Amino acid sequence: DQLTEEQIAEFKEAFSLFDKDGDGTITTKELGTVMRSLGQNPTEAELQDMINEVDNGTIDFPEFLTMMARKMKDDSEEEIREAFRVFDKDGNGYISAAELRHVMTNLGEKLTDEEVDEMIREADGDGQVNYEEFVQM
């Protein structure tokens, strides 16, 4: 994609750390390891989905570069965090269980009472949701 001179270099060197034979390939079971070496912290299911896209049990450099550029152009849990912040006057990272319940049941694509009980139950506690935590899922 429209990637940087430095970034392509950063990402080649990261890749070549896990290409022991120098055959331009790394194993799928080392993908998480290379992205962690770049200080990325992908979620179990964030790798499964990247890996199937590929499906030798092997990734070459061009499709690795592609996978990167697909996560680097798009964006993050920063937007989810920010959407909660809209509902948090304090900005102390905490939304009350009562306000969150009222917002989910009344605004946007309103949640069922079915749904908004499973949300709050997994979002626990002291009736005081800590939304950074909940965006961690």
Partner: peptide
């Protein structure tokens, strides 16, 4: 407010994706 509806639906879409796992 269109902005609050937007913010609510963003959270809502992420919560339904989650429970879809």
């Amino acid at each position: 407010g269109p902005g609050s509806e937007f913010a609510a639906a963003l959270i809502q879409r992420w919560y339904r994706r989650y429970m879809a796992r």
